[PDB]
Every structure is written in structure tokens, then in C-alpha cells.
């Protein structure tokens, strides 16, 4: 037929409009500013127990709590000054591969292979953590999860959709389709209006939760996007993939901005996170290590090492204090 | 120093820990089984001949040792980017049926089953997260593959084959053309058994082939190996 | 989540008994239990605390010696052994649970009460005893401390409870500045070290009862006087 070819025709004209878009370059134009020095942190805190590989850790939205998931069948929430475990949650399901911490506190979801959400609900008045809600209809394992308020979650699968559920009916009010291959990861944006979530397929896309469409598509890598994350402005996100490199695109300019890659980095990123100020971009590699990249620059700043394994998954704090690290070594490290 | 109510939040982390430490004491004496294979290898006969909508746990006992077997047929998504969850396994049994050597897929793509399950095979046994984890072969359906071979030849799937139509000759070849596979043999061991529906003698073979594992792992934590 | 006691009743001076106090609907075996006792007359007073697990175990210098507090976590059973009653023991007995954790809420159920009969370093002051309101009109409570609540940690540890009239106390604020989840938000609490105050905007029939001011920063566990609402 012909509509293979009305599809060319259409990504030749989006090539053309982002190339004449791309009337400079984020580098060259960054040329001007002064670098940000040697980034060089210390191990405050290490919080150990989980006996087992760690696969997904978050922040509260107070910067002192976290909630933590292993392989052990276990969601620990750790007080991160203190050391002290509030919670210590065992899973149905201990392939567990991502976890995540409602914004106001009360609730944590985790899922993993089972293919199943379970949302449990830490302010009981029974005195003990229960499960309020076990998710299901997605038809692959389930690889990130994030809240957008007290009763609604979005989930990514590996069957290549993602879904926004309503947790206390438990049915997808929304579902998202597109990728080709599995999505790996999510991102919700500062104004929880839109997401972005990166798949196997080498592409991310940015979709609006309302609409339950797809906005914009993004393609640069090479190889699998393991992770991604927005830019705090919401205008922005980078993506980290595991053909070594990280890289930026823009909403508005629909393009690829800047690319973090060394030739001396030759594994996957596993994780990405950007800091308070946008500044600094941190990204966990299977290397054993973070790299710190000044993100307006692309030069490394500064390397986050101390793992004895790889380091699976690293997050920011709210307010911006502290990196927490954690690592198939099974124990989670606090940088300050 | 620390409040009231700080004492008594450290006295909860520890009774938290002392909680955690004694689980996984219970998980370290459990022994994992990856169960792989292809839909009719036969793992819904090795699953109820081992115990009397994602991933599967099976468990069971057997002269006090307690095994949890994964069957992930499910999961219908890109094997790499979870097949790493199960590194630390101590067993993987791969299932594969022998009365499928000209039988093609149920696509009709002119692919025999045969191939597509030592292609698996060889994926699994060649792989970066089991390289020296043994693999306990199963080759389901011996009768029913002795009468589809007493009437079509095994030169369906293997052209190559320069023996008879024995069944005890035709399963030795397709024993060994299995366990060539194995490209690092001086590490991985791939134990082979032979069972259609009836023998009771598989719970046994598994734990024997699970018994060599511990006492090679053993034999490497005591420094001996 | 219940709390019922029993093993009260008359005694002569120099008896024994046990009070055993019978939980349901809640996990007993992670909260740490409290015994608190009710002068027929007067205030609050704190007797006695065993922690989740046993492991560590408080009590009062006027019972020092006398009392004895145990927990059996399978029946979900809390008992005081007394010995050597004398005749000041006489109060309505509750138990109350707490659990303690990062933004935890202590004190936060308290028991029914059983009454028992015998016939013959902190101060915490509140300086009213009596307050007649109608409702309507903002009231505000002062409480204040011998010593600085303030603790390092940035926590000021002071609870306030309100006991209506033939019931048990319930929490209101705890830490000073938040609200006790079920309680509305006319009441709230304010102030630092020393000097706190409790406010209760647009009172109604069902705020009338005695309010208590408590700390938590060490455990003589002192309660105050109590200030009674009228109207």
C-alpha cells in the first residue's frame, strides 16, 4: 500500500522541522559559564539489612524517610538520619522491582514479576502495615511505579503499555500505548500533569495523563533506556541507556540537547537523577559507580564510589541535602 | 544523647533487625529451582510429580530439604532485562519434550520444535548470569517418543544422523547433541534424566543433582575448591 | 481496637492483686503498654510502662518495688502484679498503648479502667483548675514546665489529653503541634520550652471535660494538674 510511505514522508518533514529548529548547540552555547569544580562527597550514612539485592529505593517528599525493596521478599523504610527501620513490609511476591512512596506519606506501592501493584497503607489504626490494594491487569512484569496523589498511581509494564489506575475502584482509567518495546522506567512531571516514561525500543515518549495519549516521541539511543528522569524546570529530561551514555532532550525544542558519555564508561546507566538546582546530573552505572556530570557541560564533576556491586538505583532528596544510593551489594549509601 | 522516645524508636529498629536476620536465616537453608522450557516441554507433569498471573512458586520438601521452584512461562516480555533476578538460583531444570522432533510450531513456520528448544537451550546454558550454574535437563515423553521413532526416523530433525532408529540409540543422540551445548563443561554440570508421566524417581534425581551443587558450593566456601 | 480491664474491686491494705487488661483489634505485640492510674479526686498519674517485646520495663518511685508489669503476647493479655497495697493505691487503673517511631502516635488509645477499692523530677503545672466557658468563644490553656521540653533533636515532647465526664482520656495533641487524627481542627496546640498552650476555637457541648497536660522528655512520665471546662 501507500501508508507506510505517508509515515516516511511525515518523519522526514519532523526530521527537517527539528533540524532547522537546531539552530545551535547547548555546549557551545554553555561555553561561557564556569565549571562547577570538583564535586566530592562522603558516605554519611549507610543503611544495611536487606540480606539480599536491592532493586528500587524513594524519597519521601520530607527528605528524611525512604522506602527500600529487595529481593528478600522485603520493603524496608529506613529514617535516614537516625538509621532507625520504621517499617519493615514482607512482600507475597520477593521478585520485587520497583517501589514507590506516596507524596503525603501514607502509602507505598511495590511491584515486581507477579505483574501486580500492591498498595499498602503505613497510617493504619491496627498499629501494622497492610496491603489496601493489589493492582492487577497488566500482562507483564511491572518495571516502575509512581504516585500522582493519595488515589492515583502510574505504572509501567513489560508489555510494552503503561496504566493510570484508580486504586480505590483498582481499574485502569488509563491506559497508554505506543512503545515497541518493554518500558522500563516513568517519570512524572514537577506539575504532575505529564509523564515520560523510556522503553526497549530505544525511544521515550511523553504522554498526557488526562488525554491518555502520547505527546512527543524522542529517539537518540543506540540501545535499551533503563532509566529517565525530568529536569526539575518540567522542561527537560534525561534519559540513561545502556549503551553508556545519558542524554538531555528538550519538550519544547523536541530534540536531543547534550550527550554524557566517556570512553572510559562502557557499561550501562541504571539510574538517573537530577540535583535541587538542575545542575548536577547523578548516574548510577554497572561499573560499581556514580558518575556526577556537570549537565550544562558535560564534563564529569565528580564519582560517587563505594559499591561493591552494581548500583541499581539512586534518588535525590526534595530539598536537595543528600543522594541516596542503592546497590546489589544490599546495602544503600548516603552522600552529602 | 538520645529522648525518650528515641530509645524506645532504636529499641523497634532492633527488634526490626532481629526480625530480618532470622528470615533470612529461614531463606539461606531454601533451594531455588529455575524451571524453564517451551509450552508442552512437560513442566505441568514435572510440576505434580514435584508436589505430591506472573511467576509461579512451587513449593515442596523432600528428606528435610525445601525447595521453591519459579516457572516464569507467563512472562511473555523480553527475556534479558529480568532474567538477572534469578543469578543467585542454586538449580535451573529445563524441561524439553522428545516427541516433539518433527513436530513443527503451532505457527507453522516451517521450524522445527526441536531446534527452537535447543536454541533456548543454549541461550540459557550460554549466558553471563549462569556460568557456573548446573543445569538439571529433563527429557519428558520417552514412551510416546518411542512410538512416533519405531515409524518416522530422527533424521527429521537431525539429517546428520548416521545410527539407527533404536530408541536407546536415538535418545543417547539427542542426549548428546543437548549437552553439547555446554561450552564451559570443566564448570557447569548438565544432568540428564529421562521421564514420560509415571516414574516417581524425579524428586530423587533433583535432589541428588541439588545435593552435588551444595557440595560444591560448600567445597568453594571452605576454601578446599 | 479495645482495651478492657479487670481485677478491681475492695481490698484490705497489705493484699495482692492482678489487674489484667485484654486487648483486641490491633496487633498487641508491637505497642508498648502503659499503666496509668485515676485518684478518685485528682489527676493523672503514670504507674507503670513495659516496652514492645519486654526489653525494657519503667516504673514510678511510688510503686517501685510494690508493682510488677508483664505482657503474655499470644493471649494479648498486659497484667500488674500488686503486693503491699496501701491505702493511696486506691484509683481507676487504664491502660493505654503507645508506639513509638519516626512521626509515631503515642498515647494514642486509652483503656475502659478498673476500679480498685483499698479500705483501711519534672513539675508540670497548670495554673488554672476551673474555667467557665460557653460555646462559641475561643479558650485557651496554659500548661508550663519545670524544665525545657525542647529537646535537641528539634522534638518538644508534651501531650495533651481531654477526659470528658465518665469516660476515658483521649489524645488531642501530641508533640506539642499535632493534631491526634479524629480530633477536629478547632483544637490546637502552640508555644516553646516551658510555656505551651492549648487553643480550642469555636467550643462545643462535647469539648467539656478536664484537659491534661503530659511530657514525654524522660520517664517520670508527670502529668498535670488538669483544667476543667464548665458551663
Known amino acids: 500500500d501507500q501508508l507506510r510511505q505517508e509515515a516516511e514522508q511525515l518523519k522526514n518533514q519532523i526530521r527537517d522541522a527539528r533540524k532547522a529548529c537546531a539552530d545551535a548547540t547547548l555546549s557551545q552555547i554553555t561555553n561561557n559559564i564556569d565549571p562547577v569544580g570538583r564535586i566530592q562527597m562522603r558516605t554519611r550514612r549507610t543503611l544495611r539489612g536487606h540480606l539480599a539485592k536491592i532493586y528500587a529505593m524513594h524519597w519521601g517528599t520530607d527528605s528524611r524517610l525512604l522506602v527500600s525493596a529487595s529481593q528478600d521478599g522485603k520493603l524496608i523504610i529506613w529514617d535516614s538520619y537516625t538509621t532507625n527501620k520504621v517499617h519493615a513490609i514482607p512482600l507475597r511476591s520477593s521478585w520485587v522491582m520497583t517501589c514507590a512512596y506516596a507524596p503525603s506519606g501514607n502509602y507505598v506501592a511495590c511491584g515486581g514479576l507477579d505483574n501486580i501493584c500492591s498498595i499498602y497503607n503505613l497510617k493504619t489504626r491496627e498499629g501494622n502495615v497492610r496491603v489496601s490494594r493489589e493492582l492487577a491487569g497488566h500482562t507483564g512484569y511491572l518495571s516502575c511505579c509512581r504516585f500522582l496523589d493519595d488515589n492515583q498511581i502510574v505504572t509501567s509494564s513489560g508489555d510494552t503499555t503503561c496504566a493510570l489506575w484508580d486504586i480505590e475502584t483498582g481499574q485502569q482509567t488509563t491506559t497508554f500505548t505506543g512503545h515497541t518495546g518493554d518500558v522500563m522506567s516513568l517519570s512524572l512531571a514537577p506539575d504532575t500533569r505529564l509523564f515520560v516514561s523510556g522503553a526497549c525500543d530505544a525511544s521515550a515518549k511523553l504522554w498526557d495523563v488526562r488525554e491518555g495519549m502520547c505527546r512527543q516521541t524522542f529517539t537518540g539511543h543506540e540501545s535499551d533506556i533503563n532509566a529517565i528522569c525530568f529536569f526539575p524546570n518540567g522542561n527537560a529530561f534525561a534519559t540513561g541507556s545502556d549503551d553508556a551514555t545519558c542524554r538531555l532532550f528538550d519538550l519544547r525544542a523536541d530534540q536531543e540537547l547534550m550527550t554524557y558519555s566517556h570512553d572510559n564508561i562502557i557499561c550501562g546507566i541504571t539510574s538517573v537523577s537530577f540535583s535541587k538546582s538542575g545542575r548536577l546530573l547523578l548516574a548510577g552505572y554497572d561499573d560499581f559507580n556514580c558518575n556526577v556530570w556537570d549537565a550544562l557541560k558535560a564534563d564529569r564533576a565528580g564519582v560517587l564510589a563505594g559499591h561493591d556491586n552494581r548500583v541499581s538505583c539512586l534518588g535525590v532528596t526534595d530539598d536537595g541535602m543528600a543522594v541516596a544510593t542503592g546497590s546489589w551489594d544490599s546495602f544503600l549509601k548516603i552522600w552529602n | 544523647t538520645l529522648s525518650a522516645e528515641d530509645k524506645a524508636a532504636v529499641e523497634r529498629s532492633k527488634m526490626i533487625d532481629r526480625n530480618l536476620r532470622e528470615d533470612g536465616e529461614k531463606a539461606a537453608r531454601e533451594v531455588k529451582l529455575l524451571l524453564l522450557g517451551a509450552g508442552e516441554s512437560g513442566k505441568s507433569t514435572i510440576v505434580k510429580q514435584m508436589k505430591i498471573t506472573g511467576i509461579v512458586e512451587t513449593h515442596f520438601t523432600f528428606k528435610d530439604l525445601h525447595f521453591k521452584m519459579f516457572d516464569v512461562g507467563a512472562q511473555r516480555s523480553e527475556r534479558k532485562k529480568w532474567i538477572h533476578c534469578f543469578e543467585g538460583v542454586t538449580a535451573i531444570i529445563f524441561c524439553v519434550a522428545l516427541s516433539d522432533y518433527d513436530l513443527v510450531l503451532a505457527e507453522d513456520e516451517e521450524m522445527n520444535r526441536m531446534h527452537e528448544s535447543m536454541k533456548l537451550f543454549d541461550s540459557i546454558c550460554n549466558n553471563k548470569w549462569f556460568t557456573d550454574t548446573s543445569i538439571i535437563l529433563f527429557l519428558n515423553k520417552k514412551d510416546l517418543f518411542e512410538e512416533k521413532i519405531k515409524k518416522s526416523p530422527l533424521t527429521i530433525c537431525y539429517p546428520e544422523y548416521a545410527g539407527s532408529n533404536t530408541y536407546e540409540e536415538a535418545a543417547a543422540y539427542i542426549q548428546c547433541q543437548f549437552e553439547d551445548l555446554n561450552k564451559r563443561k570443566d564448570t557447569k554440570e548438565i544432568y540428564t534424566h529421562f521421564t514420560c508421566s509415571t516414574d516417581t524417581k524425579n524428586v530423587q534425581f533433583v535432589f541428588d543433582a541439588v545435593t552435588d551443587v551444595i557440595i560444591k558450593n560448600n567445597l568453594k566456601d571452605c576454601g578446599l575448591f | 481496637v479495645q482495651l478492657v480491664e479487670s481485677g478491681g474491686g475492695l481490698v484490705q491494705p497489705g493484699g495482692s492483686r492482678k489487674l489484667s487488661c485484654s486487648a483486641s483489634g490491633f496487633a498487641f505485640s508491637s505497642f508498648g503498654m502503659h499503666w496509668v492510674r485515676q485518684a478518685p479526686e485528682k489527676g493523672l498519674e503514670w504507674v507503670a510502662y513495659?516496652?514492645?517485646?519486654?526489653?525494657?520495663?519503667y516504673y514510678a518511685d511510688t510503686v517501685k518495688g510494690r508493682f510488677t508489669i508483664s505482657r503474655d503476647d499470644p493471649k494479648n493479655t498486659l497484667f500488674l502484679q500488686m503486693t503491699s497495697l496501701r491505702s493511696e493505691d486506691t484509683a481507676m487503673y487504664y491502660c493505654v498503648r503507645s508506639i513509638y517511631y519516626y512521626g509515631s502516635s503515642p498515647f494514642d488509645f486509652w483503656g475502659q479502667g478498673t476500679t480498685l477499692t483499698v479500705s483501711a523530677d519534672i513539675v508540670m503545672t497548670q495554673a488554672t483548675s476551673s474555667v467557665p466557658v460557653t460555646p462559641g468563644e475561643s479558650v485557651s490553656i496554659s500548661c508550663r514546665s519545670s524544665?525545657?521540653?525542647?529537646?535537641?533533636?528539634?522534638?518538644?515532647?508534651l501531650y495533651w489529653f481531654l477526659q470528658r465526664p465518665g469516660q476515658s482520656p483521649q489524645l488531642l495533641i501530641y508533640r506539642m503541634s499535632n493534631l491526634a487524627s479524629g480530633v477536629p481542627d478547632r483544637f490546637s496546640g502552640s508555644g516553646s520550652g516551658t510555656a505551651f498552650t492549648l487553643t480550642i476555637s469555636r467550643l462545643e457541648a462535647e469539648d467539656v471535660g478536664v484537659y491534661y497536660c503530659m511530657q514525654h522528655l524522660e520517664y517520670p512520665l508527670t502529668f498535670g494538674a488538669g483544667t476543667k471546662l464548665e458551663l
Open positions: 524544665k525545657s521540653l525542647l529537646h535537641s533533636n528539634g522534638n518538644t515532647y
Open positions: 513495659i516496652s514492645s517485646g519486654s526489653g525494657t520495663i
